[PDB]
Structure 1
């Protein structure tokens, strides 16, 4: 019995110990969140229902997200031992691996053509 969570199978809201918290400190957190939520929802509606609108409703939250994930990565990148190793392995790791697969294969192929031990029987296109 009992349910063990994981990143790809989160904890149900009804099994969350911190969801039956009722101490006044939490309830005030949950009421400011709604107030922030309702303040925005009110502003979105005051544009959606506006009759003099002639264009779409620009989204600052979406502009920030796309900018955080492109134009803002590099300025906020600092080299460290873990980055540098990760980039070195990520960069040349796969490239060295494949070099030996292909070089090893084609050396076995060039070896077997000098000693004629290959069957290129009907092969006339390459």
Structure 2
């Protein structure tokens, strides 16, 4: 989430060393574009091309489970607090509702007159 004004004409260097770096952005962009352009405008292709940027994108989410998370830090225990935590949370919600219901059946009847269901 953005904190101040919407960042588009704000905070930029006035044509300093960043201009050489900005020219490098188009150099790598066109390098990946030209190899895409050569493998597109031929009629004898027939088939969806690979594009390694999207293949590694799927590999980042589906795989990297046990090569990652080998330093099980205190942040993982904080994530575990959001894991087991909510499962134990409802144990003091459903039981309190049940003990409210079950006591109303035996002493001081609260059961419905037209309850043929269940």
Deviations 1:44-66 (A, max 9, x none): 11111122212111121001011
Q: Which runs of no fewer than 5 residues in structure 1 stay unpaired?
A: 1-5
**Aligned with 1:13 (options 8, 12, 28):** 8
Cα contact 2:105–2:111 (8 A) shared by 1: no
Q: Which has the higher helix share?
A: 1
| 1:3 counterpart residue number | none
> In 1, Cα distance between the equivalents of 2:67 and 2:110?
56
Q: 1:117 aligns with which of 104, 109, 115?
A: 109
Alignment RMSD:
1.9
Per the normalisation by structure 2, the TM-score is: 0.88
Number of aligned residues: 117
TM-score for the superposition, normalised by structure 1 = 0.83
Cα separation, 2, equivalents of 1:11 and 1:37: 26
CA 1:45–1:21: 2 relative to 1, 3 Å: same
- Select which of 48, 58, 75 maps to 1:82: 75
- For structure 2, list consecutive stretches of 5 or more residues without a partner in the other structure: none
Runs of 4+ in structure 1 deviating by more than 6 angstroms, as ranges, are none
